[PDB]
């Protein structure tokens, strides 16, 4: 088989929670793009034809926490239908540019992790998917804030809203957002209800007050 790049001893938080190797390849069938995450020999997840497999996929920032980056992915099906949720990685970035120093994709001088992050990129765009980049001419942003009882990271990009990164993982489409309703406001924070073109409600609560004007200019886009 031909395998593209790995990266050893990733840390794994969604589907599963676990250190594992990622190894993206090309099916020897028809060639399409296969990521598989491995603890020893033991395939813990595949996707396999991430060409028509992965629903969205992107770089987001870790909060509080510059060194490291996620991968975050959605995918259609895996194999044997093991799981559902959303594949979330964290990538330390100077272990990753270690790593493809260590294949031979950048040179030892090499010190910016962006080049790491435009190789795999690229290499989407190769197999036919897309991997983006949106904290790096559109302004996302992302905040903490609860879903109820449990804090979590509420990301604003260009085409999609995500809150994560506990089970279950919400992503929402821009496009999809009908309204926004806020309620409980006071000096320090903010409700902020997002209703779906199929009706569908979703609640976000202790929101800074600060976010105000982000996420009303985000809902007014277009």
């Known amino acids: 088989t031909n395998t593209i790049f790995k990266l050893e001893g990733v840390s794994v938080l969604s589907p ?22 491995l603890k020893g020999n033991d395939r813990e997840l595949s996707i396999y034809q991430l060409n ?29 239908n093991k799981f559902s949720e959303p594949v979330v990685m964290t990538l330390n970035k ?12 950048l040179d030892s001088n090499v010190t910016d992790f962006e080049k790491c992050v435009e190789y795999i990129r690229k290499q989407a765009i190769l197999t036919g998917f897309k991997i983006s980049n949106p904290f790096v ?15 979590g990271t509420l990301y604003f990009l260009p085409d999609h809203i995500i809150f994560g990164f ?3 993982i919400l992503l929402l489409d821009a496009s999809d957002i009908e309204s926004i309703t806020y309620s ?11 209703v779906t073109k199929d009706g569908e409600k979703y609640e976000f609560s202790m929101i800074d007050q600060t976010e105000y004007a982000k996420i009303d200019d985000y809902v007014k886009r277009k």
Do not use: W
């Open 16 to 37: 599963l929670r676990k250190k594992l190797d990622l190894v993206f390849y090309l099916s020897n069938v028809d060639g399409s793009p296969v990521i598989t995450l």
């Open 52 to 80: 028509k497999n992965i629903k969205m996929a992107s770089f987001l920032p870790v909060p509080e926490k510059p060194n490291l980056i996620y991968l975050f992915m959605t995918y259609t099906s895996c194999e044997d």
């Open 94 to 105: 100077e272990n990753t540019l270690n790593q493809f120093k260590k294949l031979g994709l």
């Open 137 to 151: 001419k559109i302004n996302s942003f992302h905040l903490q804030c609860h879903r109820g009882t449990k804090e």
């Open 166 to 168: 506990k089970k279950p």
């Open 184 to 194: 409980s406001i006071t000096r320090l924070t903010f409700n902020a209800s997002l």
